[PDB]
């Protein structure tokens, strides 16, 4: 008799007792884990039961366990995608579950989401969220996010410089990359920073909190790094 049939029988017996006894189902899953710890189905069932019970700690431990042990299962990626979409009661519970996951494990799962995304704007927004969550990741993702946005805008052939990529860069990516001291940049790129922020506010005001203030702050940061509106 193959072990797959025994594992399926154990999982079915655990499932049948979920509406009747939660402790018994968790105990059966623990037994199956003790017998065959290398099973994705049993541990995933335990994770699903813990998540449905809204137990943040146990569900986070199990999610970390299968994310380390079982990365090829599409269900794990679906769960991580749902968690990231919530990150961008159920939403708060998913955020708590993500927080229970270790910080390095959080960064690695967000990076694995980064490698699995196709659309440019969604990937840019999620990378920016990664930057905000882990400012230490702004060093080797912040700048690249900004250029990737700029070349995406250029490829799309935006007749008006007003578009989502440039706005995301100037308002979110640009402050993150200029405000990070660890990010070493040449003096030539501040010219493009000022050019894009300037196109931003001139094509915004002409036609949000303060485009003029953000542009002025970027210009001041550029000026200080190179080393009222009237006295100057």
């Amino acid at each position: 008799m193959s072990a797959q049939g025994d594992c399926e029988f154990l999982v079915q017996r655990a499932r049948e007792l979920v509406p009747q006894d939660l402790w018994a189902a968790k105990a059966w899953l623990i037994t199956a884990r003790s017998l065959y710890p290398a099973d994705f189905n049993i541990q995933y069932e335990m994770y699903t039961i813990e998540r449905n019970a809204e137990r943040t700690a146990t569900a986070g431990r199990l999610l970390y366990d299968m994310f380390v042990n079982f990365p090829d299962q599409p269900v794990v990626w679906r769960e991580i995608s749902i968690i990231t979409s919530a990150l961008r009661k159920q939403t708060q519970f998913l955020r708590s579950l993500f927080e229970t996951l270790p910080g390095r494990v959080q960064c690695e799962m967000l990076l694995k989401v980064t490698e699995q995304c196709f659309n440019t704007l969604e990937r840019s927004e999620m990378l920016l969220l990664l930057l905000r969550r882990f400012p230490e990741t702004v060093v080797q993702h912040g700048v690249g996010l900004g250029e990737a946005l700029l070349e995406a805008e250029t490829i799309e052939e935006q007749e008006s410089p007003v578009n989502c990529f440039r706005k995301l860069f100037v308002c979110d990516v640009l402050p993150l990359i200029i405000n990070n001291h660890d990010v070493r940049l040449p003096a030539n790129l501040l010219y493009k920073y000022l050019n894009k922020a300037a196109e931003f506010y001139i094509n915004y005001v002409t036609r949000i909190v303060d485009p003029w203030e953000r542009l002025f702050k970027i210009l001041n940061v550029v000026g200080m790094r190179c080393e009222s509106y009237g006295d100057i």
Binding site: A27, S34, L35
Partner: protein
Amino acid sequence: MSDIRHSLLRRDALSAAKEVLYHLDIYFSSQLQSAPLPIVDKGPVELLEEFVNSLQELQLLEIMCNYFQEQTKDSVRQIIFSSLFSPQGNKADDSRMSLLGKLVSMAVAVCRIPVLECAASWLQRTPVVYCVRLAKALVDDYCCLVPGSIQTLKQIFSASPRFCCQFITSVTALYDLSSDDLIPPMDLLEMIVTWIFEDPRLILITFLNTPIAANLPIGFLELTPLVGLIRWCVKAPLAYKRKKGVGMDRDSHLLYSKLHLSVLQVLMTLQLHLTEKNLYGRLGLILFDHMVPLVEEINRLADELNPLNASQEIELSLDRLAQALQVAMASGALLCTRDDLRTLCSRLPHNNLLQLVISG
């Protein structure tokens, strides 16, 4: 020595006891300063027996708990606690058990974590019969004499969590569910289940906090109540089917299930913990010699109860026991094999989970 005793005879009982106790404190402190392992000579024991109504008993208990609490050295408090209360094999052991019951009862009442940890070490250092008797007296005091007093016992769960572990151990030794009387009261179980559910390491405190001898003393309290708690949850349905109220039965099954799952979480963390102290596969905290009484008790209970009338309870007990053995092994809490599980359960009635665990 005798000069103090003559000076003690001219004093009243309370002052004589306090002079004895201060003299013992001074003597033990000096001996500990001189030697690392002191010797409890016949003199201190004789003085404690000679000099140490209910009113004066209450005063003596107060001022002695004052002495434990005011003692700044753990060694001195533990040693004097043992010397006073370690059963000496004399007629004063029954008094020892009674007076120790009163002492630790009121110490739990006022959360005397010094006396609590002292009683933990004493239970660690006491034969099973006196821990049984003391568990009897305390369980009475906190669960059946005055109802609702166990909440005062319950706060100890985390006050003196080491004392909590030794309490569950000696309490399991008494309330091993071998009899309806040795079924723990419902308040006691709700305490312990809440205790352990709140802290799986609560019963892992002593294992992680004591240099473990390769051999666990027998006839004493076992290192963990994991054996006792497993004995509890496992014989727990058969004892209540024997007792037969539907709601109380359902609540007992639920609290037993929670105790069992807490014990199992303890076990699956015990793989990591035994590995941490390099005792995984070396030291089986669940002694297989301490699961055999459990398994035999279960088989007898199934045999007498006319299995045609109690099939459900038999199946549940078999499933719980098989899971306990499997988790204890896979986590190294128990040291055994699968052929051992086969020969262990040859005489038992057929059960699917037990057959699967045995086959592997």
